[PDB]
Amino acid sequence: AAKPYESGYIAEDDFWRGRGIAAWVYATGANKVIAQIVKDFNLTDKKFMVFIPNDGAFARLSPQLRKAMMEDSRLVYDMLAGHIFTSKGSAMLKDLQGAGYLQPAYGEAIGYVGTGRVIKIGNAQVIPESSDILRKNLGFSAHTLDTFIVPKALTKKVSIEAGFSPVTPAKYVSTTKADLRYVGATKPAAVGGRRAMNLMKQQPFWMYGPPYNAVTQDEYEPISAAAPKAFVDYQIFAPGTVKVSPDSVNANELNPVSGMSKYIGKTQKLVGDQGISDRSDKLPM
Amino acid sequence: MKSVITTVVSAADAAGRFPSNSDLESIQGNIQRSAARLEAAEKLAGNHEAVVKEAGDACFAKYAYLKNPGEAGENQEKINKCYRDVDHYMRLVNYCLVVGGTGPLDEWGIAGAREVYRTLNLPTSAYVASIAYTRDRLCVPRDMSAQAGVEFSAYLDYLINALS
Amino acid sequence: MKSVITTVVSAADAAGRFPSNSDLESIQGNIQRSAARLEAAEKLAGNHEAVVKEAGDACFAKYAYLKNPGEAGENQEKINKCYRDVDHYMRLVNYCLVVGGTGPLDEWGIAGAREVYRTLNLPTSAYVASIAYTRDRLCVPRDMSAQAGVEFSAYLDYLINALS
Amino acid sequence: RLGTVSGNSSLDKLGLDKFLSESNRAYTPRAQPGFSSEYEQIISATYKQLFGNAYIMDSERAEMAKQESMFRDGQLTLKDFCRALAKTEQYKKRFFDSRPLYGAIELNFKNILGRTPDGLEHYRAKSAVYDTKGYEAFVDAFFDDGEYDEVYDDYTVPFYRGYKTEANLSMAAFTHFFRMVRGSSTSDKANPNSMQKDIPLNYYGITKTPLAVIAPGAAGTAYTESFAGTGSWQSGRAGLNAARVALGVPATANGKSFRVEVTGYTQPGFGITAGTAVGKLYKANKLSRYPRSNKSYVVGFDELTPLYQRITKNGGTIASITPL
Amino acid sequence: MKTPITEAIATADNQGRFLSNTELQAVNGRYQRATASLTAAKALTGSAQRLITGAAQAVYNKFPYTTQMPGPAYASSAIGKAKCARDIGYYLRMVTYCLVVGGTGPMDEYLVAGLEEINRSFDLSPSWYIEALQYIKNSHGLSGQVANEANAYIDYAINTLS
Amino acid sequence: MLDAFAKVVAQADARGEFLSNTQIDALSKMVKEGNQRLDIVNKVTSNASAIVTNSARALFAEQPQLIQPGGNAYTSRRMAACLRDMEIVLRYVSYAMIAGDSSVLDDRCLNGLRETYQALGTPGSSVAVAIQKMKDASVALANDTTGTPIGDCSSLVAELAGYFDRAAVSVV
Amino acid sequence: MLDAFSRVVVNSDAKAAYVGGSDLQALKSFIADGNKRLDAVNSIVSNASCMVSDAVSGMICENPGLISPGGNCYTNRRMAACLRDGEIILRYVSYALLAGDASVLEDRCLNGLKETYIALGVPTNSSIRAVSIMKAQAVAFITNTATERKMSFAAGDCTSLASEVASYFDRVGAAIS
Numbered sequence A: 001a002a003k004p005y006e007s008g009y010i011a012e013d014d015f016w017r018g019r020g021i022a023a024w025v026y027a028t029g030a031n032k033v034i035a036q037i038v039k040d041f042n043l044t045d046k047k048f049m050v051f052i053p054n055d056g057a058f059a060r061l062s063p064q065l066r067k068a069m070m071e072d073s074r075l076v077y078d079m080l081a082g083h084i085f086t087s088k089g090s091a092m093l094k095d096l097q098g099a100g101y102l103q104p105a106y107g108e109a110i111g112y113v114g115t116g117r118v119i120k121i122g123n124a125q126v127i128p129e130s131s132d133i134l135r136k137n138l139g140f141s142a143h144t145l146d147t148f149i150v151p152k153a154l155t156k157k158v159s160i161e162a163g164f165s166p167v168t169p170a171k172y173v174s175t176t177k178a179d180l181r182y183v184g185a186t187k188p189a190a191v192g193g194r195r196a197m198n199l200m201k202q203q204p205f206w207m208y209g210p211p212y213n214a215v216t217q218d219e220y221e222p223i224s225a226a227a228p229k230a231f232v233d234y235q236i237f238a239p240g241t242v243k244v245s246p247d248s249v250n251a252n253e254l255n256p257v258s259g260m261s262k263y264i265g266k267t268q269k270l271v272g273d274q275g276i277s278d279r280s281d282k283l284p285m
Numbered sequence B, C: 001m002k003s004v005i006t007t008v009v010s011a012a013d014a015a016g017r018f019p020s021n022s023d024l025e026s027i028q029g030n031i032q033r034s035a036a037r038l039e040a041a042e043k044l045a046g047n048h049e050a051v052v053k054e055a056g057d058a059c060f061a062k063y064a065y066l067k068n069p070g071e072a073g074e075n076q077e078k079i080n081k082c083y084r085d086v087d088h089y090m091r092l093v094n095y096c097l098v099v100g101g102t103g104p105l106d107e108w109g110i111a112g113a114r115e116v117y118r119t120l121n122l123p124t125s126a127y128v129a130s131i132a133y134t135r136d137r138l139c140v141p142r143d144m145s146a147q148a149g150v151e152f153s154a155y156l157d158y159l160i161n162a163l164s
Numbered sequence D: 001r002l003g004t005v006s007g008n009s010s011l012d013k014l015g016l017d018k019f020l021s022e023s024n025r026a027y028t029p030r031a032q033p034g035f036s037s038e039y040e041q042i043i044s045a046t047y048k049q050l051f052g053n054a055y056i057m058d059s060e061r062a063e064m065a066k067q068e069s070m071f072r073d074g075q076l077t078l079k080d081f082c083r084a085l086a087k088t089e090q091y092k093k094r095f096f097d098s099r100p101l102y103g104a105i106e107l108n109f110k111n112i113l114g115r116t117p118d119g120l121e122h123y124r125a126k127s128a129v130y131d132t133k134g135y136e137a138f139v140d141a142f143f144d145d146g147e148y149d150e151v152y153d154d155y156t157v158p159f160y161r162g163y164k165t166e167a168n169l170s171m172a173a174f175t176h177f178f179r180m181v182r183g184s185s186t187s188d189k190a191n192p193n194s195m196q197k198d199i200p201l202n203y204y205g206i207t208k209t210p211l212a213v214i215a216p217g218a219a220g221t222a223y224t225e226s227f228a229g230t231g232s233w234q235s236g237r238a239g240l241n242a243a244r245v246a247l248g249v250p251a252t253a254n255g256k257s258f259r260v261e262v263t264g265y266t267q268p269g270f271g272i273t274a275g276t277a278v279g280k281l282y283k284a285n286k287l288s289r290y291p292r293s294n295k296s297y298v299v300g301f302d303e304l305t306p307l308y309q310r311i312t313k314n315g316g317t318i319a320s321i322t323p324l
Numbered sequence E: 001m002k003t004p005i006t007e008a009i010a011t012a013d014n015q016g017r018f019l020s021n022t023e024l025q026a027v028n029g030r031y032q033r034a035t036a037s038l039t040a041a042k043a044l045t046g047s048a049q050r051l052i053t054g055a056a057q058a059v060y061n062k063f064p065y066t067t068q069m070p071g072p073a074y075a076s077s078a079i080g081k082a083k084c085a086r087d088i089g090y091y092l093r094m095v096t097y098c099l100v101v102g103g104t105g106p107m108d109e110y111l112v113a114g115l116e117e118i119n120r121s122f123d124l125s126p127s128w129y130i131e132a133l134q135y136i137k138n139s140h141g142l143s144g145q146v147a148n149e150a151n152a153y154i155d156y157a158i159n160t161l162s
Numbered sequence F: 001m002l003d004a005f006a007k008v009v010a011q012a013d014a015r016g017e018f019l020s021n022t023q024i025d026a027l028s029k030m031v032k033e034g035n036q037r038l039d040i041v042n043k044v045t046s047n048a049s050a051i052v053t054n055s056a057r058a059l060f061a062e063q064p065q066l067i068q069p070g071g072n073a074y075t076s077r078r079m080a081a082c083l084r085d086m087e088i089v090l091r092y093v094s095y096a097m098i099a100g101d102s103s104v105l106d107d108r109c110l111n112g113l114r115e116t117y118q119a120l121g122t123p124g125s126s127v128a129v130a131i132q133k134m135k136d137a138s139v140a141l142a143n144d145t146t147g148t149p150i151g152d153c154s155s156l157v158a159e160l161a162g163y164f165d166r167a168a169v170s171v172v
Numbered sequence G: 001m002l003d004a005f006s007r008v009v010v011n012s013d014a015k016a017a018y019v020g021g022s023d024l025q026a027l028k029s030f031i032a033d034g035n036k037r038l039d040a041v042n043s044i045v046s047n048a049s050c051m052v053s054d055a056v057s058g059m060i061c062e063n064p065g066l067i068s069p070g071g072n073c074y075t076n077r078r079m080a081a082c083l084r085d086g087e088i089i090l091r092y093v094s095y096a097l098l099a100g101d102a103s104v105l106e107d108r109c110l111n112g113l114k115e116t117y118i119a120l121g122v123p124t125n126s127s128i129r130a131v132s133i134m135k136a137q138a139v140a141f142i143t144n145t146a147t148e149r150k151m152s153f154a155a156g157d158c159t160s161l162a163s164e165v166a167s168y169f170d171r172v173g174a175a176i177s
């Protein structure tokens, strides 16, 4: 509502904003409920004891439980009434020793186990580093938990099989220069033309070998069958205009000791690239 | 004596193979994680006399019925053997930190324990309740470093699941 | 596959236990070592056609007798299967740097290899001379880094010692 | 994982993935005084093998605490410990006292030797020891014939080898191995063909007829069938299981014959309609549409694709197809 | 299960063809009606205990012999009363399943197949369950086409019972 | 068979529960996609002959031993049965796309397909290459506009790709 | 049994492809988010005894006919085996979370578990509910939303690890069904 630093922090509604362990009670409207609880059970005269869960306890609260605290305002009432205890009054941490029981404001009774410095209130643990704060007027003790005191009698209505089982979506990782190749194979071959063989990918270099004989994409082109009758003469040009250039002037790169030659013979099909081609450049003709 | 070294040497022996590159990689993780647990064990060494005294009072506080005549904590002599038997479990987790695995707990503290305790009529829940206390009074940036508390807690829950 | 994960899982499955603190300490070694062995696996996967063909004719530069009649490098098909079988071995070394152990080399390249290279009469010292050429071709600052070349050569002479 | 392709392996995804990964070899003649963790693993490994992954509780494991201690200094693990554990009451209660003699005989072939009886003469050689000398020598003939020291080192645990080719068995014994060992999450109390009371290979282990192998974790992995004679002489009954022969004119008309095994037949889902039929739910005579689920068929090749659609559209699950 | 989605698949798979626009429109009409059906199912769920306690009391008012006569079939004892508020919650839950799915499928597979056989055997009267369903048709508080979708599956179960 | 709406109902009947308020809000999103799902089923079905034939054409370019004498697609009856199977898998993947659940896909196509190809000798590593070639012909046909309004359908093309990967691992 | 890295190797081996470029980035992400995975596997095996007892007890409290004469978990031999049937299932799920792949859970546990549970006569509806209770416990310890324990972690989000281990538990219910 107003700023908490007005009237110092001596006001009771502004003190728990100052001692910033429970910030969820003012971020939600939970502080309206505990003011309405002590109306409803008349705790304003007699001393009592509260166990406020801290920030982090609200953050570790489960998504199958935090939904059920939103669709049921009665469930938010007794869970916050399950932290206000009227057994021992304004009890410090040294009076919470041994094993025993505690009476809540509304719910049926909750057992505590207090062993020295570790003190459990039943699915909760008092952090004792900041838990012995006592207010003099409207007098109670307040201790800090790390988990909500959730009794099992409330939460048989909740489960994870309602739909709070967490699932992540996985999406496909295709690249846009690859599925632009693959759309031309979806058309039929009378209208897709030379794009109907677009689905074949790059084989390894031994797959075009003489045991396996994988067919390249260029046999399906007409560029394999370029066998004309006509021929350039090459002697009618001016001398110096016919140019030729070898691949490498080396005996050992043109042909190794094995037959794996990239330039001479029938082993020129055994290249790791040159299996597919770019015939999505032209047309669907 | 389960360690990181002992697990890969015994698995290379089970297949009759030499130490491969998959085996020296596991010894590298023993080098990185060493500085975490070797100063937790240094912390447990010089401050064990007060940790077991704090943990020793935390089981007679929970189970106050042990001091009854006819129970396991009648006189001072049977009380002295309980602070002794919890000082042994704090020495065996000091061994598990410098080894690198659950070896010294699995041999000398856990194997054979649930038939010793059943025959000698000792409740295992009170050997539990002092182990779960020092797991709970440990806050990670004060008592040790941030990664030493992960290793120190990892053996206390291993001891708890063994007794329970 | 023999890996770092599959070793520590199988060791804790035969013992019938949960993943311990020493089984998580081994996967941390898989993190601090993955930077070097994925650099070698990426350097190899980009330039593999030039590494295979440079090593395929290092076989025939040492053993020119394989083109004699009846041998294993007579015709065009037999050298296509020879450059294939070297490229198979370099793919499995790329698979071993990715996984982190000698898993894919053992199950897919080495097991059963002595009985095939003897039945079909392929000289096993020539499936080695191509692997040994690649191990000495590697310049330790030029192609990869220092620890990436340690991992690359250690899987390269595991294959040499398994064929010898 | 299922299949044969995609990993270049067939046996690990046939149910043998855990078994193809262990040695459990006991590398020292006596257990070292001071340490228990290494030898507790070997005792838990020879319990899982010799008892066939049965549950031994702590009140029953304490009944064999004596032998466990003789093994830790002064006995072998292959001999003299598996032999000692087979004479115990825990072994005898669930593997011998529950079944007939030929049922107990092939559970000892699986548990001690790791394989199956090949023919009738493997059964007959072991029943003759029991008839003349009793149970105490009956379990020694599995240890003290030639086969046991030949295939196992006398400090290793036994392992399954009835699928391998170096265990020189018939090829009908390969198919029988995958009736008695169904993956690693199964015992012979948890086997639907022997439920710690039956003879698992009764007609088939004697006559050496092969069975179709169904992988554990498949679609129709729940397929089981009964046994019944068919002839007039043995007073049999017709119409329970399909034949395994394909004899006549229907064998080669419509092409090559196959034998298809279907598993799950329910009353909801017969028609071409995506939903159950509402109304009477049963005809007069009150019988189901399929009185047994787990039906079998003998079909030609030209009738295989109409039958495949007739199975799956009516709720069935194809368990196995095998060419006759 | 009978659904506008699965009946389109089953009529194309029976003919052995691909999903044409005959089938893409039958599932387009399921998506138009789905907004009215999902508000009708969220409201019947959130007011289920009011509708369950009220509909059971509406049967004890019309047929008061069901809280009087001895025997196992009648709601005389506290055990026969608990097995009646369980039967109303079964009939109501199948209606909210049919609104979510989009057809008379979940109450065919789970409730009305075999319904006349379990009524005649355990000696239950179908007139008890009709009056329990006429209450929910008159007390769900829905309006418009939201109530048209809810009352279409309530009226479907009254036709099988009668 | 049962679709994605019937899938969560069957999971809720076996617990004996009404559907949650969170679960109705998750089925409103499945109706909110609605038209984008019907665009993918429209594009895949309308080009069904060209997807099957041009990805069979590209299979025999890379594995040309399948149509040699002694190969598994050499004869007219053995080639026509190969195109028939590739149209069967594309049919039940479009059935699984309109339903949002892979239940008709395995109960009526996939269960028993590995057992069939192992009794016949059909190479299962070549069937999965034909399945993976119809996949990227169809997930590239899914995310092109071509008379659809512009928007993000990247969550529904990860679902269509997951039905092609499911059919491919049930045969390999 | 395959881990996460050896799963993309058997996918590359099916097409004679090297692993590099596009696929190495999804595996370099596995290493970068790898400290979270060890920090989450530790959270499950630290509480592995209380998780199993609370799952079989909660299966019994909702369906108390299982401990009657005729129920499957009647005697002490049957209750101790049901407490051990679930302790193994939790063990194999923690292997698949450490590996990043569900192959060890399917090879060694789920292949054959269905016909295990139909020979013994185990009710599959009750065993699915016992797994479902373990699923809610595993997501609660990973995302630190446990109402009975508060584990210490570094700050961050681990929703992808919780949605991963939830998919392993749903394979258990789909197998034995």
Ligand SMILES: C=CC1=C(C)[C@@H](Cc2[nH]c(/C=C3N=C(/C=C4\NC(=O)[C@H](C)[C@H]4CC)C(C)=C\3CCC(=O)O)c(CCC(=O)O)c2C)NC1=O
Binding pocket: A221, A222, A223, A224
């Ligand atoms: C229906 C009628 C009809 C035609 C006219 C030709 C037209 C034609 N030419 C080429 C293909 C080509 N056309 C040329 C031709 C020339 N480049 C030059 O520098 C010269 C100016 C000119 C020859 C005089 C060349 C060089 C290529 C090969 C292109 C390449 O891939 O490098 C292609 C691509 C298909 C293939 O590569 O096989 C087509 C459709 N084809 C037809 O079906």
Ligand SMILES: C=CC1=C(C)[C@@H](Cc2[nH]c(/C=C3N=C(/C=C4\NC(=O)[C@H](C)[C@H]4CC)C(C)=C\3CCC(=O)O)c(CCC(=O)O)c2C)NC1=O
Binding pocket: B059, B066, B071, B072, B073, B078, B079, B081, B082, B083, B085, B086, B088, B089, B108, B109, B116, B120, B122, B123, B126, B127, B130
């Ligand atoms: C080196 C490894 C090592 C260990 C882990 C312990 C384990 C251990 N503790 C005890 C023994 C004991 N443990 C307790 C403990 C208790 N009784 C109580 O009142 C409480 C329930 C609880 C306090 C913690 C007692 C009283 C004994 C002595 C038993 C007796 O006197 O009868 C014994 C029997 C021998 C003896 O100490 O008398 C052993 C082996 N001892 C070891 O040597």
Ligand SMILES: C=CC1=C(C)[C@@H](Cc2[nH]c(/C=C3N=C(/C=C4\NC(=O)[C@H](C)[C@H]4CC)C(C)=C\3CCC(=O)O)c(CCC(=O)O)c2C)NC1=O
Binding pocket: A117, A128, A129, B043, B044, B047, B050, B051, B054, B134, B136, B137, B138, B139, B140, B142, B143, B144
């Ligand atoms: C190596 C073993 C080892 C342990 C198990 C713990 C246990 C422990 N805690 C404290 C002592 C303390 N421990 C805390 C606790 C905390 N303080 C905070 O800032 C956090 C909020 C919270 C972490 C839960 C506090 C406030 C004290 C001082 C008060 C006291 O307990 O006496 C002491 C007394 C010595 C001292 O610290 O003054 C010991 C032994 N510390 C250890 O060295």
Ligand SMILES: C=CC1=C(C)[C@@H](Cc2[nH]c(/C=C3N=C(/C=C4\NC(=O)[C@H](C)[C@H]4CC)C(C)=C\3CCC(=O)O)c(CCC(=O)O)c2C)NC1=O
Binding pocket: C059, C066, C071, C072, C073, C078, C079, C081, C082, C083, C085, C086, C088, C089, C108, C109, C116, C120, C122, C123, C126, C127, C130
């Ligand atoms: C995935 C792992 C994997 C491998 C490592 C290889 C291993 C391998 N290589 C060859 C096969 C071969 N290896 C060679 C090799 C050579 N010839 C020579 O002159 C030199 C000795 C050497 C070149 C280095 C030849 C010629 C064959 C074919 C044998 C033949 O033609 O009969 C074969 C026989 C099958 C075939 O015909 O291809 C196999 C299994 N294959 C695999 O699947």
Ligand SMILES: C=CC1=C(C)[C@@H](Cc2[nH]c(/C=C3N=C(/C=C4\NC(=O)[C@H](C)[C@H]4CC)C(C)=C\3CCC(=O)O)c(CCC(=O)O)c2C)NC1=O
Binding pocket: C043, C044, C045, C047, C050, C051, C054, C134, C137, C138, C139, C140, C142, C143
């Ligand atoms: C993926 C695996 C992989 C390897 C194992 C290496 C191996 C390698 N080295 C060279 C190539 C070379 N390597 C060297 C060697 C050296 N150069 C120096 O500056 C150093 C002094 C010395 C290190 C010993 C030289 C001088 C060349 C160029 C001459 C040649 O073609 O070999 C080439 C040919 C391509 C080129 O670099 O032009 C290859 C494949 N590179 C790789 O990509």
Ligand SMILES: C=CC1=C(C)[C@@H](Cc2[nH]c(/C=C3N=C(/C=C4\NC(=O)[C@H](C)[C@H]4CC)C(C)=C\3CCC(=O)O)c(CCC(=O)O)c2C)NC1=O
Binding pocket: E024, E025, E028, F034, F035, F036, F038, F039, F040, F042, F142, F143, F144, F145, F148, F149, F150, F151, F152, F153, F156
């Ligand atoms: C019976 C036959 C039948 C169909 C075929 C569909 C056809 C269809 N799609 C959309 C509507 C749409 N369709 C798409 C889908 C896409 N847009 C893209 O860019 C992607 C390529 C593709 C996803 C894969 C999107 C994104 C919208 C909504 C437009 C928007 O909100 O931006 C609409 C209008 C609804 C609206 O505008 O919200 C219609 C009628 N519906 C039918 O009833």
Ligand SMILES: C=CC1=C(C)[C@@H](Cc2[nH]c(/C=C3N=C(/C=C4\NC(=O)[C@H](C)[C@H]4CC)C(C)=C\3CCC(=O)O)c(CCC(=O)O)c2C)NC1=O
Binding pocket: D053, D054, D055, D056, D184, D185, D186, D187, D188, D189, D190, G056, G066, G072, G073, G077, G078, G079, G081, G082, G083, G085, G086, G088, G089, G108, G109, G113, G116, G120, G122, G123, G126, G127, G130
């Ligand atoms: C590798 C993985 C692996 C498993 C999963 C288990 C699977 C398994 N469970 C049991 C055996 C059993 N499993 C159960 C479990 C249950 N019954 C119920 O009612 C509950 C729903 C459920 C507990 C969650 C019970 C009660 C038995 C014993 C049945 C009996 O003793 O008759 C058996 C037979 C034990 C024997 O033969 O002695 C096997 C093999 N074992 C394995 O090795």
Ligand SMILES: C=CC1=C(C)[C@@H](Cc2[nH]c(/C=C3N=C(/C=C4\NC(=O)[C@H](C)[C@H]4CC)C(C)=C\3CCC(=O)O)c(CCC(=O)O)c2C)NC1=O
Binding pocket: A062, A123, A152, A156, A158, A159, A160, A161, G047, G050, G051, G054, G055, G057, G058, G059, G060, G061, G062, G132, G133, G136, G137, G140, G141, G145, G146, G147, G148, G149
């Ligand atoms: C019939 C009797 C009966 C029971 C025994 C409990 C059993 C029980 N526990 C949980 C639910 C849970 N159980 C645990 C487990 C633990 N929590 C801790 O504080 C410990 C560290 C650890 C073991 C004791 C956790 C972490 C949750 C989820 C959230 C939480 O409690 O923090 C659930 C919900 C499962 C679901 O969502 O479907 C059930 C039914 N409930 C019952 O109705």
Ligand SMILES: C=CC1=C(C)[C@@H](Cc2[nH]c(/C=C3N=C(/C=C4\NC(=O)[C@H](C)[C@H]4CC)C(C)=C\3CCC(=O)O)c(CCC(=O)O)c2C)NC1=O
Binding pocket: B033, B147, B150, C028, G032, G033, G034, G035, G036, G038, G039, G040, G142, G143, G144, G153, G154, G155, G156, G157, G158, G159, G161
């Ligand atoms: C060295 C070996 C090793 C361990 C001893 C354990 C312990 C551990 N956890 C984390 C570190 C972490 N652990 C988590 C996990 C979580 N945090 C949450 O808030 C969730 C509740 C939970 C599951 C999602 C996160 C989010 C980080 C931060 C680092 C990261 O995001 O990778 C780190 C890295 C912090 C650092 O760099 O120092 C370590 C060492 N894990 C290991 O790998």
Ligand SMILES: CCC1=C(C)/C(=C/C2=NC(=C\c3[nH]c(/C=C4\NC(=O)[C@H](C)[C@H]4CC)c(C)c3CCC(=O)O)/C(CCC(=O)O)=C2C)NC1=O
Binding pocket: D231, D232, D233, D234, D247, D248, D249
């Ligand atoms: C492809 C064509 C074809 C063949 C090969 C065939 C064999 C055949 N012989 C059968 C029975 C039989 N076969 C015999 C034959 C003999 N028993 C003897 O003791 C003699 C040694 C011997 C012949 C003299 C008898 C007696 C039966 C009846 C078995 C019985 O009812 O117990 C049966 C069982 C069905 C039946 O009882 O009619 C088949 C299928 N049936 C065929 O349709």
Ligand SMILES: CCC1=C(C)/C(=C/C2=NC(=C\c3[nH]c(/C=C4\NC(=O)[C@H](C)[C@H]4CC)c(C)c3CCC(=O)O)/C(CCC(=O)O)=C2C)NC1=O
Binding pocket: D265, D266, D267, D268, D286, D287, D288, D290, D291, D292, D293
């Ligand atoms: C030849 C004469 C004949 C026999 C013997 C026969 C048995 C038979 N019982 C069946 C089902 C059934 N049987 C039961 C019976 C029971 N479930 C229980 O929980 C109780 C313990 C028990 C009896 C009260 C149930 C519930 C089904 C349906 C299972 C299902 O369809 O999912 C089915 C499956 C098909 C169907 O739904 O009808 C057959 C074939 N059918 C026949 O025609």
Ligand SMILES: CCC1=C(C)/C(=C/C2=NC(=C\c3[nH]c(/C=C4\NC(=O)[C@H](C)[C@H]4CC)c(C)c3CCC(=O)O)/C(CCC(=O)O)=C2C)NC1=O
Binding pocket: E056, E059, E066, E067, E072, E073, E074, E075, E076, E079, E080, E081, E083, E084, E085, E087, E090, E110, E111, E118, E122, E124, E128, E132
């Ligand atoms: C999900 C689909 C489904 C339906 C429809 C269903 C009905 C159903 N109601 C039953 C009993 C019952 N139904 C009633 C209900 C009534 N009797 C009265 O007096 C009232 C007027 C009326 C309720 C308003 C009673 C009292 C029984 C117990 C009868 C007996 O045990 O003999 C029984 C006998 C089995 C049992 O004892 O539980 C069935 C099967 N069960 C189902 O699973």
Ligand SMILES: CCC1=C(C)/C(=C/C2=NC(=C\c3[nH]c(/C=C4\NC(=O)[C@H](C)[C@H]4CC)c(C)c3CCC(=O)O)/C(CCC(=O)O)=C2C)NC1=O
Binding pocket: D301, D304, D305, D306, D308, D309, F066, F072, F073, F077, F078, F079, F081, F082, F083, F085, F086, F088, F108, F109, F110, F113, F116, F120, F122, F123, F126, F127, F130
């Ligand atoms: C529920 C719907 C359904 C399925 C799932 C089905 C599978 C099926 N595929 C078959 C054959 C076949 N399937 C293939 C397919 C291939 N072989 C190859 O080399 C390629 C890699 C691959 C596809 C391109 C071939 C070649 C045959 C014929 C095998 C033979 O005739 O021997 C047959 C044998 C009958 C015949 O068609 O001649 C069946 C029953 N049939 C069905 O009705």
